[PDB]
Symmetry: D2
């Protein structure tokens, strides 16, 4: 049993290879800000030796009001990424919500994404199936890990066969998430050992971001999917929970001494 | 504290009024079948004295494969309802999945609906907001009842102020649903005592359909939302779980001796 | 398939027979109080026509401090019941925590009981097995209903074969209970259709006591197990949640129009 | 904020110190076997440089039948440990179920223990309070981590102030456990930073023993609490889930490269 590869460009994403960080930012507030954000990761990434992918959203179809900030917009959002790629030389992972946005973003970026809440939207997956560009299937809170196969199959059946599975904890009572650490493994199986990643800042909806991201790494994953803001305290709105920018590096050393020190272990078996 | 009314035509839906059945069928297989289905309810309804609304889907955006039956289609689906209304004189409740389908169905039917998985899709709610036609907000399995206000507010903010809340149990471990009977009440509150209904066949994903629908009724609801098939055993596919048609009537007597015998109780208070 | 009977004296407890209330009080504060409590039930019981059993604890092995009120004590507690039986002519259901208390209480009362937390204490069940006096197995929050057989078997194997199963909801996240209404049925099965009862005030750990106890009754049970205090608001300590004494009667009319109106239904089957 | 120490003899148990393994075996089948078990740990422990404590039960008050193996017995069980201590020079951690067994075991062993199911048994804790010998509070599946203070307080109030908290996952639906990795931290707090340990073989009720024990270590704990059997496959009965003896060492290297490589990290803060 070997691991699978859904490599994006010069990058190879696989459970036995070193972890690839799909960090970044939540919503695209403004290039002035964005870029500054895309700036630290890159520096810390290259400086620490960790594959990178920048993430940012150009739209928030979901919120608690219409009289709020949708986002940069699909048309005005794609552009914004452009200016970024060239400037820094990193890929762009963003999420789609309409069968239209499908192809566009396919040209503008590298790693597209499927929102959890839509993981079971035939029409939209049969459309993302076209692009043939790497896909990220965020795992819905209300869905058992062993159900990740059907979603992966359907992607195959549509033409695309390069998919990734991101974990964001699972419902635990009302208004609460807990990350079954045994999930990741069960998820490897049903998808054909496809790439598995942990969306930590999202499994938290805190000082916990560290300790909680540490555990997931010591199990062996194809990487993380994080978010950080320069001033978390104030921008402190809702949805996920971002990281304290400055603390990016010292935090990322925590992972390597894991993502490396564990991605090079002599396969064990507490089975037989 | 009085109850609210989101009456559809000659029908009044409210927590203190008798229960209104939003029964029907899942997907629209064929008028030959549909109608036969729409036939028994109507007979049993009128014969037993229970308000009625027929439900049927014209599309299943969600499934486990593209190489399967989407459904009658929006354009070819709406028509099918037409032929029904006149023939029997009952309203039509169906669900939408696209901001387009919004207005169309608004003319063709009476009770439109919001799928759970989309309960938090701004754009699509701001669109359903237009129609101004009664709305049904299926409560997502992964969402606490006290969160039903924001969804109800947003509907107001968009213009529509006639909304209903349907309950379908809440996640309990992996691959399992349990219906918090205390939900219904908590749901009345946050929405401004809006109409609350139980989607039983869906809270089950069995001989349990009865016993489980009984409990919900003895708490006092603005009604149920059921489904039945003439040959459940064979058509035994997945998604919800339908009822055994024939058993419609004797089953519905179970509710009345509740929906009535409890909808006429001297308000109690185990509070003070 | 017929129901089983674990009748205590002139009382017959069974799922198809009318519900038997095992109400009463939590801890035995004082006869002056106790009795007053035992007074209203009895009056309302006889006045409404509902079998009765009074419940009260003579010890609270579990609490949040040693420097607190253990309880009347086993030796000084048993006596207290005596004075009650004669005065009112109702049985006494109390819980045990030691293999010693086993036999004593067996002579002093009618319905002994097994605490949930101990449902799996061999030695203590093999001891309660002796008494041969009716037993009540409170169902632990952390145990699936289908596991209630083993506990019932062991009771048989020990000699006793008259056991009852009380339901108190099941863990739902941290610090929260939800009552799977489908539990009761699943519990009937594995125990050999033994008697099933709902411990409502305990499934709540409120104005909810009513609405929540209504649901359970409309499913058909061998009765309830409640608690009420004359001044809930103040005595408002913790553990279960008692009922507002005065409100006993008007509340109990709610049940009959259910426990009766449903205990006389023409067996249905949404199965075939 | 410094960590606390509840050191047993020449051993110091604390969250910031290296992890201490409280491994061993479940029930005491026989010295012939026991010892052989106590043999590998010791060898691997000393050989790998990891503090050790051997665990084994001398009684199983809980089971699924009386006509089964209780265990060596308290009187005949204590003795068995004796012969072990001298032979190998390691401490003995065993669990108690009666206020009597309290003091005895206090002389015979080093680390006594509180069973989860009894974590809230006043009388028995007020008794374990006497011994003044280190205590292990297994955290009940049905109890939130933030509730671990009251249990720790009561232990203080009784005289003993050297307590440890062992985590064994928390209920997740029916018949299932999931380990909230964020638990450990929350548990440190409420107990006064007391010692926290993970009971992995018990959080599993498999090949998962490894991956799952890895996560817990990368969060930083005062150690583990494991169990292994020479022939797991056959002795494959129930209760916890043991480890494959032989695989003890290569498995324990997994922990050190964590328990060490993380117990020597520059305190981070994703907080501010
Ligand atoms: O919103 C979320 O919480 C997650 C994951 F947790 O992703 P998505 O935006 O695709 O639903
Ligand atoms: O699919 C379901 O289970 C429910 C409710 F349970 O409704 P919807 O089709 O809107 O998600
Ligand atoms: O304490 C409880 O909550 C219940 C039931 F919920 O009974 P017991 O005292 O036997 O554990
Ligand atoms: O039995 C168990 O599962 C655990 C812990 F999971 O310990 P205890 O024997 O004290 O209840």
């Amino acid at each position: 049993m070997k691991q699978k590869v859904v490599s994006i460009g010069d990058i190879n994403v696989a459970n036995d290879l070193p972890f690839v960080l799909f960090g970044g930012m939540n919503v695209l507030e403004s290039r002035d800000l964005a870029m500054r954000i895309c700036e630290h990761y890159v520096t810390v990434t290259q400086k620490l030796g960790i594959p990178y992918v920048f993430k940012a959203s150009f739209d928030k179809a979901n919120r608690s009001s219409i009289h709020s900030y949708r986002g940069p917009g699909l048309e005005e959002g794609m552009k914004i990424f452009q200016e970024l790629k060239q400037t820094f030389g990193v890929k762009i992972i963003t999420d789609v919500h309409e069968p239209s946005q499908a192809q566009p973003v396919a040209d503008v970026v590298d790693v597209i994404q499927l929102p959890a809440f839509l993981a079971r939207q035939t029409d939209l997956v049969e459309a993302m199936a076209k692009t043939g560009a790497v896909i990220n299937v965020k795992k819905p809170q209300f869905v058992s890990p062993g159900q990740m196969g059907n979603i992966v199959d359907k992607f195959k059946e549509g033409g695309n066969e390069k998919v990734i599975l991101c974990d964001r904890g699972a419902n635990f009572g009302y208004d609460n998430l807990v990350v079954d650490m045994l999930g990741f493994s069960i998820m490897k199986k049903v998808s054909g050992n496809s790439p598995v990643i942990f969306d930590v800042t999202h499994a938290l909806q805190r000082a916990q971001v560290a300790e909680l991201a540490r555990a997931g790494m010591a199990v062996g994953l194809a990487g993380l999917f994080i978010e950080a803001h320069p001033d978390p305290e104030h921008a402190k709105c809702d949805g996920p929970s971002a990281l304290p920018l400055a603390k990016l590096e010292p935090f990322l050393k925590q992972m390597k001494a894991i993502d490396d020190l564990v991605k090079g272990f002599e396969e064990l078996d507490t089975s037989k």
